[PDB]
Amino acid sequence: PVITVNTNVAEKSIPVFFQAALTNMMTKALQKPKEVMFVDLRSGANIMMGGDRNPCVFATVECIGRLNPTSNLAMARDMEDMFIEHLNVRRERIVIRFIPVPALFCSFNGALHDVS
Amino acid sequence: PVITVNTNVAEKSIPVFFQAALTNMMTKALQKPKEVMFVDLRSGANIMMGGDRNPCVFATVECIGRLNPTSNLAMARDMEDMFIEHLNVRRERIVIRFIPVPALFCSFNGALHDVSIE
Amino acid sequence: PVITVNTNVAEKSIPVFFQAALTNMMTKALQKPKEVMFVDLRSGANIMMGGDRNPCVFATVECIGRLNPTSNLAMARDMEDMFIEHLNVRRERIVIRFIPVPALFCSFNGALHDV
Known part of the structure; x- marks a missing residue:
């Protein structure tokens, strides 16, 4: 799977273990081997939301199988958290x-x- | 919605209100709440087109509903402009x-x- | 078409002809006009794979038509190479x-x- 995180939050504000933690959480959530789990973190991105530059995230989860409305909502809440x-x-x-x-x-x- | 702009045009060349203007234009075009409109600008990107580095843009418009051949063409022309x-x-x-x-x-x-709702 | 290459490999490590070569190879492979072939190289990207930062690539090929299991495998192997x-x-x-x-x-x- 590929987890892409587009955020205007600066890299210096993000824990060094963030990608590792997200890798582990999404390996468990998607029941996909860690070996093929990518986390592509775009921090300090020039991404605005609602016309303003308050902290925001647009993230994507690309996955073969595993995605359905029930699993999507559960994973969305866990990712949001x-x-x-x-x-x-x-x-x-x-x-x-x-x-x-x-x-x-x-x-x-x-x-x-x-x-x- | 998410508007992603991938361009080799340098950030310093782009008007400071470009993302705000695109936000406003695509909020009106897509009839979606402005508050959930993202504009992700990748300027000075290492993107080549046709094997050359003349200015180019590859942009994407991610939207729940609203996209259809008629609306796509109208929005494409407005975005191009x-x-x-x-x-x-x-x-x-x-x-x-x-x-x-x-x-x-x-x-x-x-x-x-x-x-x-969407 | 758009070829997007997301790699943690540093720009300075990549041959200066890489995007031109990939443009030519994928123009031939997809039989699409070179004029509308993009290669968007995201080098030195903060992309990790398998929880580690060994060199990796996640690439995408966006194309109108041309994509099918047979062509995908042939192009994948050529892009991997x-x-x-x-x-x-x-x-x-x-x-x-x-x-x-x-x-x-x-x-x-x-x-x-x-x-």
Whole structure:
């Protein structure tokens, strides 16, 4: 999976373990091996929300399988809680998009993904 | 909604009100609350087009509802006009992708979206 | 089409011809006009994989048409080979997502695309 965090929160404000913690949380949530879990953190990004530069997050979760409205809401709340705790962003400044990826439209290590 | 602008035009060349202007223009175009409009500007990006480094833009518009061929063309032309004016990019150096987002695949403020509100 | 390369490999480590070479290779592979081929290289990105900061790539290929399991695998292997050779990333640290784009959901030069 790929977890992308777009935030105007400065890198210096973010705990050094943030990506590791998000990796672990999303490995558990998505039941996906850590080996193929990416966290792409865009901190100090030039991202504004509502026309203002108060702290905000737009995050994406790209995953083969695992995404559905029930799991999405549970994971969104858990991700929001991590962003609130670690990035000091208000819940009403967080938006998360869940992006289903087809197995045969994603390569890893010289092959597509083999899912029955 | 999320407007993402990937451009090789340098930040110093871009009007300071570009993201505000794009926010306002796309809030009106998409008829979405301004408060949930993001504009993510990647200026001075290492993006080449056609194998050359003349000014270019690849932009994306992520939105729950609102995107359809008619609205996409109208918004593309309006975005191109703003990119031409603000970034001094030629219309033939602009590509925009419109990305429909499912209501139940997008959270805001501790909840997913309501299809009927969106 | 848009080829987006997200890598923690530093810009200074990447051959000056890399984006040009990838442009040419993917113009041929996708049979799309070179004029509308973007390569958006995000080098020195803060992207970690497997909880560690060994060299990695997450790349995307956004294309109207052309993407299917057969073409995806062939292009993936060719892109992996370029990443291995030029970015010194191991094949087991490369993931590529192929993203089909609808013709009427993408503009170029004041018009949507032919469908």
